[PDB]
């Protein structure tokens, strides 16, 4: 691709420069070139990839919510322009998610590698299908919801077998799967049950953690607790 002539190490350096400059589209394009060199990503490099694309789709999802909100007011008792511009932002958002999902399927999701890496990429596959589900309709939405559920469930099965209940990647996965159940899959009961179980199984083990590990686990437990406040 466009990054094919650049050294992998130069692409990682330029991703870090783009991040300092808050150029997230550039950061993502540099991390996509790095992935396409076909080597595994390090823990730090996985997080650069994730930060880049989450910033890009975050902007698109924020814009989509602003426009969708305006579209729904004008429709409650004024021209096609709000819908047309919402559709444009939607197609751009879909393009970014398809890019991330293609990188995951083509390069990053593997049978091999540590549990942490396998869960990280399957959770990302669930997250990007969830972002597609937020804007989808009809039969397409039902296929996307099944795809998101399947990715999150495979990740959840690995994390139960291979990680402790306090492991931040396990906790993050459960947090996002709970949001999926609540906001996408119309399963508020499953969302609440998963957030309670995740919180309670971590709570039982907190006494075993170093002060750095305690910080990381309890930050995500506070999000589960914030969601349970909102949902109960």
């Amino acid at each position: 691709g466009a990054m094919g002539s650049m050294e992998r190490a130069s692409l990682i350096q330029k991703a870090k420069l783009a991040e300092q400059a808050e150029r997230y589209e550039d950061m993502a394009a540099f991390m996509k070139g790095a992935v396409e060199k076909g080597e595994e990503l390090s823990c730090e490099e996985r997080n650069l990839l994730s930060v880049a694309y989450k910033n890009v789709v975050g902007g698109q999802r924020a814009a989509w919510r602003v426009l969708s909100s305006i579209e729904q007011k004008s429709n409650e008792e004024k021209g096609p322009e709000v819908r047309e511009y919402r559709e444009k932002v939607e197609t751009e958002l879909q393009g970014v998610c398809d890019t991330v999902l293609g990188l995951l399927d083509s390069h990053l999701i593997k049978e091999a590698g540590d549990a942490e890496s396998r869960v990280f990429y399957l959770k990302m596959k669930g997250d990007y299908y969830r972002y597609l589900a937020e804007v989808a309709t009809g039969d397409d939405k039902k296929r996307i919801i099944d795809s998101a559920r399947s990715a999150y469930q495979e990740a959840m099965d690995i994390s139960k077998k291979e990680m402790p209940p306090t492991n931040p990647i396990r906790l993050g996965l459960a947090l996002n799967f709970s949001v999926f159940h609540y906001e996408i899959a119309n399963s508020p009961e499953e969302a609440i049950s998963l957030a309670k179980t995740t919180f309670d199984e971590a709570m039982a083990d907190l006494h075993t953690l170093s002060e750095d590990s305690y910080k990381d686990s309890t930050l995500i437990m506070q999000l589960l607790r914030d969601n349970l406040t909102l949902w109960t």
Binding site: S50, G172, L175, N176, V179, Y182, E183, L223, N227, L230
Partner: peptide, 8 residues
């Protein structure tokens, strides 16, 4: 308010 996903 909106439910929180992982800040990432």
């Amino acid at each position: 308010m909106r439910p929180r996903s992982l800040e990432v």
